[PDB]
RNA sequence: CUUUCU
RNA sequence: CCUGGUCCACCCGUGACGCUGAGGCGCGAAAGCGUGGGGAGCAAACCGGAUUAGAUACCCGGGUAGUCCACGCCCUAAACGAUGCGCGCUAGGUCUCUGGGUCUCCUGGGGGCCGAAGCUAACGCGUUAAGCGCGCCGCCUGGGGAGUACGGCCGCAAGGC
RNA sequence: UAGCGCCGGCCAACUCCGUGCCAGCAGCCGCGGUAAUACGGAGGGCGCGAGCGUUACCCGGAUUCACUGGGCGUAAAGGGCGUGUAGGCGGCCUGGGGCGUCCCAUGUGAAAGACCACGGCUCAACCGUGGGGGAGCGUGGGAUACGCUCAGGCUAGACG
């Protein structure tokens, strides 16, 4: 079976971007969709949009990009240098909204499931609450 | 009890000058005038490109030596600028700066720290009236720092705050030369002080 | 202009029937304080010579570390082969906290203030890379800004 | 300069083993061969000439490099139809690289033509008469469009990329824009500037670069007629 | 074929 | 003759019934053990020849257990891909085995080789992962002492765990 | 009154003499078999200083039991394979519950110690006063994204 859909999803996005796919697929579910809106804000990816492969619902995902390098490997810079599964199951992750840590000094975010919806930490922390730290992203 | 011993040494091991003797300090004999360099047989041999420890142990071994001071006493003053708030650099040298034997020493009072130190030590000197002859009090802020009615007839603290006659003081001090008194204003900051000395050396040093 | 500080120099070997053939190994940092650090690998028959081609090679392959106030934007770990090197930014008065290697890089990059720690492989020249490797990853939240722009 | 009926040549072109990032300049196989897409090839050649207007009307040097045997001539003429230099042969590792030595070949061939010429001309055993005779040889066998190059060049101009990794690669080391006329079997990400087009076959080579060494000219107040080069056509 | 040690 | 696994096509039925798995139970090469049978060839041990300084060996001639069958036991191994199982994800190229197709190619299952990205100390691995992830089991924590001692459990014994 | 340790590298501090794989040093690597900065003394030096050094033990260094934070093709490390119990883990949509989880208030969290501030003894050590922090648990109120639970639905896993 598919034992964790959400680290399925970032490991999906991580595994496209590493090879500069412009698009990317990952079989569709509202928690999943909520958590690229937040993709999406914090500007991590372009975006994604709900299609129907092989008559089931997924989610394109469009990446993106630095741009083109120098020298050799011109291959781009990263938007998403990191993304990391936390909380998983049969090993879940909850904090306090004081124990919501500050990924990477501030320049990276988390994204917290909060009985509030699933916020970032800024998000979090600013309507003063803690939930499952579902992953780093920097 | 303190150092005690061939002090200009200290000052051509340290290659820097040390003022640990006030006068002739400035004349030309303080040795680093024409033998800048290290005591013992080898003062001459070339120097081996000295090693990360060796830099920071000397930097210390410099700054200490100058306010001539034990390790113990020196490290928990550290340790202490190191707990308090702001640039630990700062607030150790501002606590160095705050021992009255040093303020004594900073006030033409006396010739050189040591000397003061000795002037503390025999009473000569006052905190805000009452007498303290522990040179490593705390001077702070506001406290004015006079002499011993008693000893302000002696030649010593004559001819020392005869010369002081003219000469200006650090400004986060000043002194009435008249009543022999001075007054600690503010704790002197980094910039206020000119020592030979990189502090964050002092404070790497502390780190291993 | 720029400093220069030689972190090892090492002997090494080579055999031929007849003897031990030796050819010594220099590694260099280079930086001008200000935000330029340089890291250069030179092998020569004689150590001078080494030394030299190691500067050279150092110059001609810098960095630009995104100082500010003395620190780093943001904590790194970067593993180069079985080296890792941690870099943790640190406030004013902390002093540089590194391993000599680490350091010498560090200070010459310009960097007054930082929390550093060598996880596995302690060997400098891999270490050594990897430090310079870790800033040449560190970003600003201008450029984390640039990035997600669009 | 330009047209879009290129399709009387260049176009399509390589069996099938492609290099799957080439991707997007293909249009599909038929009978077997892909089909590199013209409009694209277009696309790149504006974006691509135009970097080269720029770059000519600057007076800036242009290194083409072409070792393929299937343009290895209209490398040299193209390359000499402009004050243009050009590897024709074999490209020596460095050349890019390691400059300021392959530099010292250049200054040896020079040095040479003299003493063929001075007073020594018939001096020493023919022997070294003889061997110097071979130093030239050899020496003009490879540096006679590398011969200009006075420093490193500004950009290149490489035939095929893949054929030519090398030479690319030195460039890439010392962010030496790179251009080509390259197609199905190479990496295009490795291409600054791209023509993707027929890598191999002159009836396309030809008309490319001389279209880009026109488009030098045209730029760079010769206003040349028409290249010597379409005589190797046949 | 076998064909030890230093 | 009896019977297990397995793959493909159609997408027809059930509707999360799933994955892993401490114990348990079972299977488990060879050699070995018990009872009975068999015994051509081969062959530990053994009996001889030769070689050798010696030859308790290698070579040559014989040769018993055994190798074979049955029923029962033993349970180990370089029991190896020295690589636990399941699922998802990440270029291709080439050869091959088997199924389907509109069958000079596409497509599913399997066996190989070269390889993108990536990983790795290196060697190498690379959609048959040693890459990117999640789940569950097992296991490691310097060498020798030592798979030994002691205790327990299993075995007819050898011996195993 | 000034002593004690150290000066091959880790590690700050180098020379002469004596000895000659001896006598000895030694934490590890090692040093000593006639030029020893490594033994013994001396001169000189480095570090601490009424202390200095040793031994012992604990934490550290040791991400070397790895939750933070490690690993198992060849380094130590995949179980000989399967079937399978307990247990661990669980696809998509919706509804109820609100156990986990998050939030607020409140009680408790003694004093001492720790932290900050000011103060007392000439300073400090020591001590006094005041203030702030504090996981955990109790009670009440709230939230429901995720996990659990219950119910309903689904076909993309699985089975047929
Ligand atoms: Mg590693
Ligand atoms: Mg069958
Ligand atoms: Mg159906
Ligand atoms: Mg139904
Ligand atoms: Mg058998
Ligand atoms: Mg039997
Ligand atoms: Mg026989
Ligand atoms: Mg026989
Ligand atoms: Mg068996
Ligand atoms: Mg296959
Ligand atoms: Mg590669
Ligand atoms: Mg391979
Ligand atoms: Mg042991
Ligand atoms: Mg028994
Ligand atoms: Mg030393
Ligand atoms: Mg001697
Ligand atoms: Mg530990
Ligand atoms: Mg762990
Ligand atoms: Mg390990
Ligand atoms: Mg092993
Ligand atoms: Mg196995
Ligand atoms: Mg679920
Ligand atoms: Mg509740
Ligand atoms: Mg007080
Ligand atoms: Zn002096």
Same mark, same amino acid.
């Given at each position: 079976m598919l034992t964790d859909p959400?680290?399925?999803?970032?490991?999906?996005?991580?595994?496209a971007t590493r090879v500069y796919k412009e698009s990317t697929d990952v079989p569709a579910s509202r928690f999943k969709e909520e958590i690229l809106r937040i993709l999406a804000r914090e500007g991590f990816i372009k975006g994604y949009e709900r299609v129907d492969v092989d008559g089931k619902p997924y989610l394109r995902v469009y990446l993106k990009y630095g741009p083109r390098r120098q020298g050799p490997d011109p291959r781009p810079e990263q938007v998403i240098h990191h993304i990391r599964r936390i909380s998983k199951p049969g090993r879940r992750v909850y904090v306090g909204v004081k124990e919501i840590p500050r990924v990477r000094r501030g320049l990276g975010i988390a994204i917290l499931s909060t009985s509030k919806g699933v916020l970032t930490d800024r998000e979090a922390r600013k309507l003063g609450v803690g939930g499952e730290l579902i992953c780093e992203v920097w | 009890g303190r150092y005690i011993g061939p002090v200009c040494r200290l000052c051509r091991r340290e290659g820097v000058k040390l003022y640990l003797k006030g006068e002739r300090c400035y004349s030309p004999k303080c040795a680093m005038e024409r033998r800048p360099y290290p005591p013992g047989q080898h003062g001459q041999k070339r120097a081996r490109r000295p090693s990360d420890y060796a830099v920071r142990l000397r930097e210390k071994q410099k700054l200490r030596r100058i306010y001539g001071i034990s390790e113990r006493q020196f490290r928990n003053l550290f340790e202490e600028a190191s707990k308090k708030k702001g640039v630990t650099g700062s607030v150790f040298l501002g606590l160095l700066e705050s021992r009255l034997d040093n303020v004594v020493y900073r006030?033409?009072?006396?010739?050189?720290?040591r000397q003061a130190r000795q002037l503390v030590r025999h009473g000569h000197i006052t905190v805000n009236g009452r007498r303290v002859d522990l040179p490593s009090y705390r001077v702070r802020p506001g406290d004015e720092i006079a002499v011993a009615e008693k000893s302000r007839n002696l030649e010593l603290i004559r001819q020392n705050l005869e010369a002081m006659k003219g000469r200006k003081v650090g400004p986060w001090l000043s002194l009435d030369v008249e009543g022999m008194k001075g007054k600690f204003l503010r704790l002197p900051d980094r910039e206020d002080l000119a020592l030979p000395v990189q502090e964050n050396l002092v404070i790497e040093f502390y780190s291993r | 202009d720029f400093e220069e500080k030689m972190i090892l120099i090492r002997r090494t070997a080579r055999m031929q029937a007849g003897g031990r053939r030796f050819r010594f190994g220099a590694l260099v940092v280079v930086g001008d304080r200000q935000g330029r650090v340089g890291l250069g690998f030179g092998k020569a028959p004689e150590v001078p010579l080494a030394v030299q081609k190691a500067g050279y090679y150092a110059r001609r392959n810098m960095v630009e570390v995104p100082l500010q106030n003395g620190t780093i934007p943001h904590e790194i770990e970067v593993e180069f082969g079985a080296s890792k090197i941690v870099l943790k930014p640190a406030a004013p008065g902390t002093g540089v906290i590194a391993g000599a290697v680490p350091r010498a890089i560090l200070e010459l990059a310009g960097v007054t203030d930082?929390? *550093?720690? %060598?996880?596995?492989?302690?060997?400098?020249?891999?270490?050594?890379?990897? *430090?310079? %490797?870790?800033?040449?990853?560190l970003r600003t939240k201008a450029d984390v800004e640039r990035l997600r722009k669009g | 300069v330009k047209e879009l009926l290129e399709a009387g040549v260049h176009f399509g072109h390589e069996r099938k083993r492609w290099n799957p990032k080439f991707a997007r300049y293909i249009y599909a196989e038929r009978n077997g061969i892909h089909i590199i897409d013209l409009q694209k090839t277009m696309e790149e050649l504006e974006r691509t000439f135009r970097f080269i207007e720029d770059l000519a009307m600057r007076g800036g040097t242009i290194l083409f490099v072409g070792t393929k045997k299937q343009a290895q001539d209209?490398?040299?003429?193209?390359?000499?139809?402009?004050?243009?230099?050009?590897?024709?042969?074999?490209?020596?590792?460095?050349?890019?690289?390691?400059?300021?030595?392959?530099?010292?070949?250049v200054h040896r061939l020079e040095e040479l033509e003299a003493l063929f010429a001075s007073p020594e001309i018939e001096e020493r055993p023919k022997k070294e008469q003889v061997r110097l005779k071979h130093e030239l040889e050899r020496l003009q066998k490879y540096l006679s469009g590398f011969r200009l190059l006075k420093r490193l060049p500004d950009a290149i101009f490489v035939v095929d990329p893949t054929k030519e990794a090398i030479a690319v690669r030195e460039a890439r080391k010392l962010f030496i824009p790179v251009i080509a006329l390259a197609d199905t079997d190479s990496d295009p990400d490795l291409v600054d500037y791209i023509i993707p087009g027929n890598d191999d076959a002159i009836r396309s080579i030809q008309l490319i670069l001389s279209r880009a060494v026109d488009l030098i000219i045209q730029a760079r107040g010769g206003v040349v007629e028409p290249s010597p080069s379409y005589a190797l056509v046949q």
């Open positions: 959400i680290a399925d999803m970032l490991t999906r996005i991580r595994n | 006030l033409g009072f006396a010739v050189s720290r | 930082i929390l *550093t720690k %060598e996880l596995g492989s302690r060997n400098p020249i891999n270490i050594a890379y990897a *430090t310079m %490797e870790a800033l040449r990853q | 209209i490398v040299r003429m193209e390359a000499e139809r402009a004050g243009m230099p050009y590897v024709n042969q074999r490209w020596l590792g460095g050349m890019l690289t390691n400059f300021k030595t392959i530099s010292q070949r």
